[PDB]
Amino acid sequence: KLGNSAICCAYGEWPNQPERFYTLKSVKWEAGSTGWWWKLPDALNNIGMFGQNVQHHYLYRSGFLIHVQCNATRFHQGALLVVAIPEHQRGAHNTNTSPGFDDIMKGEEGGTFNHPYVLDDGTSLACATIFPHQWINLRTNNSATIVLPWMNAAPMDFPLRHNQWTLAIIPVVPLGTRTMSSMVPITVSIAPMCCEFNGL
Amino acid sequence: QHGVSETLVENFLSRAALVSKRSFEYKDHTKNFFKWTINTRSFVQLRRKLELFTYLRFDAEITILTTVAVNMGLPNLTLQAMFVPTGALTPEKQDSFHWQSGSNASVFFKISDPPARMTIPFMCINSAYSVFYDGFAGFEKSGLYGINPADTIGNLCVRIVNEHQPVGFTVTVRVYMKPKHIKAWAPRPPRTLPYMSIANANYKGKKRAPNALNAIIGNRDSVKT
Amino acid sequence: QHGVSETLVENFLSRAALVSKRSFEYKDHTKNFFKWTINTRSFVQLRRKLELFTYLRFDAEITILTTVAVNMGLPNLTLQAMFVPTGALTPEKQDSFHWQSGSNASVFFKISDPPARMTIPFMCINSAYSVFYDGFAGFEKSGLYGINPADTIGNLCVRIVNEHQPVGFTVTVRVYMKPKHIKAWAPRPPRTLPYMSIANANYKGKKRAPNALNAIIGNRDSVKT
Amino acid sequence: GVPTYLLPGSGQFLTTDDHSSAPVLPCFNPTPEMHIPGQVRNMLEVVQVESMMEINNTESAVGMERLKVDISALTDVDQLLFNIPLDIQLDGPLRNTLVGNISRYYTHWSGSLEMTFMFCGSFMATGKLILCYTPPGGSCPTTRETAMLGTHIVWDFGLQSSVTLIIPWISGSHYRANVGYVTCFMQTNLIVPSESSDTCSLIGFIAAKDDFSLRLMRDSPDIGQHLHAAEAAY
Amino acid sequence: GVPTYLLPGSGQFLTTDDHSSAPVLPCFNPTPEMHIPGQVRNMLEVVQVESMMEINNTESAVGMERLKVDISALTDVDQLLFNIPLDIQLDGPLRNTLVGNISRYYTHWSGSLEMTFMFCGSFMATGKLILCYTPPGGSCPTTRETAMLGTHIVWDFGLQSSVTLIIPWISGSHYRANVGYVTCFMQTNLIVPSESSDTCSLIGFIAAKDDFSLRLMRDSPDIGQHLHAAEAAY
Amino acid sequence: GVPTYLLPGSGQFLTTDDHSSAPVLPCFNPTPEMHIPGQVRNMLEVVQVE
Lengths: 200, 225, 225, 234, 234, 50
Hints:
6 chains; B: 225 residues; mainly beta; Jelly Rolls; four-stranded antiparallel beta sheet; D: mainly beta; five-stranded antiparallel beta sheet; virus entry into host cell (chain A); capsid protein (chain A); Rhv-like (chain A)
């Protein structure tokens, strides 16, 4: 419970100034889903107190606390890989041109994995557990929580030009039930940690 | 190297590799000089190893190996390898004024000598190089994706100091770069698909498995085989 | 260099720069030798840095870099670089008696060797060199303005020791001078206008801004733009 | 001065030598080391993170269908589901893992592997599997009755959802017929209720353990060569 | 004697090397060091001395008219007088300063700047200015009402004659849109008596502060190339 | 052995250098120093004679 809004550490790091969850729109998970991604802080630059701090200051320095919750019955099955990818330089498929500004900076709506098997950058989803990650096996649990530190070589950074973390939610085992028409909502809540801003 | 593990990131990465190999012709008529922007994206064997990590901090041990061949006797020539970092001006020509620069570090070496060797320090203004940059360089939307302006090492400009001669000889400049004092952060999945460019991380995959787009491992007949 | 600051006047100035570059021809017919009065006024990049200060005290690390080219095989020649200080006699010719001088410090080096290198000490009779001299040399009114007679380092005379040969080869002598143990006094404004001569501090300015006489900075439209 | 003489091997450039060299820019002070999260000091730290096997290494498994094995209510009572050839050197299910990619940079590996199988059916899906480890050179079993003479465990995936199967110390490139197998048989059928899906999936993982070792480093067979904009640097 | 072998990099002339060398005249004893006033040991000592900005960087300002901004009794009540683009890299008002010339010998600068504005009207000239600092990327204001959301001070130059405006720590070549602005608006009109001149001038200064830093030295873009009597030395 | 590298200025003959060199005849013992009157150690001793 942070702020007024109510509802594991990456690499063993705990980040230590305004001090709440920004619940994004629920995405709807079906059998044909490939995945979802949100780049941070691009998902939060147009929202609320953090958006007023971004659009009026010039440098940002903050960690992130992400709670992904996937609410289903006991007759649903499926596994998600909720993985946070630092510096997720996306590649484009079958072309030599780099992805544009529209292909990367999707805002609050986020994006969809085109080829989640290669994480859309020629790497592998199988080895994607080298990142900070949690699994949502609907048989077992329905939620995931990832702490994200300040991931930068630089001390402070530009929020409108660069996205340090990418939260990815990839269905490894697809959504299943008997009458294959069911949907399961996934709700993402992102709380920034230690919101340091400069250059008012 | 001299550790215990052999899987230390110092041992895994500090290993000299041919990062650049370009011949350039030299004659009495008026490129007649070598110039190369210092990166590691050029060869995919070193590139995939360094792209196992997100952030890298290292010194660069350049070793210029120079051979000469006829197009009697191989002439003993003097070469100038000049490191032009980011922010300084590069020579447009072989006889330009930028070779005379006091502040650009040059090195003057012969073909008869052992190969020239310098150590380029950690040239970034951040605390690590960004192997992967999830952002845009300029403050406009016309900026390129994945190119950190703070990440460029510099340029390595190599010319022949001698005056122009009527003889025909080709000078091949092999550049060997070997990282030193490697610190590495945030390991990444190894790249499975083949590279398409050096400017970005685009992917196409091979036509069939292995390393295809929809099948990274080559198939077997059945799961029970 | 190895300080902490990188703006130390030792670090700011001790940096090897091409102070002199002159080819001279050599043949069997009877200048056939190199001679250069040691100053720093010749190149404006080093000159403007040293003219940031009024008084400078430094040793001079000369590095003679010698290349040879055809007008088969580059001949291995012996050269003599001889430092003639102020007060001693200079060679008028290549085969003169002044090359045999016991007291003028010579150095005998080959083209095959690493480049010759000497350290010229602090040669002034005052406690610092006068970069700017607000006075006249001689005790007459026919003296020149801005030329301290105590300020001259000496001459660097370079010849080829070998006897004259019928072959045609041009010998280019690059001289690299690098100050050492720099002490500097009384900093001055950096020069904005371009130089007109090396003997004095005359000024004309460029035709338009920037660095013009009446406008050093290039203009903008209005002060409120 | 000091009388010296040049040894054989002077003036050579060994690419693996460890000498110092001339700093091209002294008094350039690099940006001091900030604390960045997740520093890797040893590549055996990477090799011990679990990562998905492709235990569906077949045709008609397009993309992410290779990462999971489907079990259904129409599979037989003692049917073989999958087998995992324990080949890090050879292209198999273990190739594109963190233990499989880093080890192909080395020639000799040795250590214990750690397989984890995670069942991804519904909450009320019930059944038993039997995971059998076959040592190198032993017979890969075909029936459930035969696979009792080796190291095997019976996994009721109603009770548990994950199973760790420690593969014992192999010593790797000492064999150079196979280097081992892990097979899985149905014990029971898959029992699901009527609202649940009748097809349920398994995800397999593998990591190295603490006694893992890699030596005699080579270059990886996986990467190899055109590159676009390769002459833009010149 | 001592068995040696030559490393790669022997016989080369690196221009930035720091070795000793042969003294061409030993036992020549140079003139010993007298105490001369004003020794500079560090170029950051020079960079912290204040020097005039050209805050009148326009055409029709011939020579020394570039160093001063005239304010008059006919300027508007909330008119913009001048703005100073905080560019040391780019040619602007800060180019020909002690902080602007020494920093163009270096590539990366970082530190706080210190602007001083001195009013040079008569003794009985009275009025108020408002000096507004705009951080990098922020909007350069056009009206006096808009310029209240940032760091601004209101300067009654009847009371004071000088104002120090500390520019906060920038870190310089991290941006490579502008690196900041300092604007000035009229607050009141200029009030002079009848014997005084109705046009009064401002002089702006800038120095670096103690946290200023310069690294990765290059050669200056300002100087560059004929030289008369250049062949008299030969 | 000892890894070395040659500096700029190797192999040159500076006429004013002060190094030792190979004795062309070792174990030739020169005639030992007798006391001879009027040794000059400094040329400023000569300059002060009227």
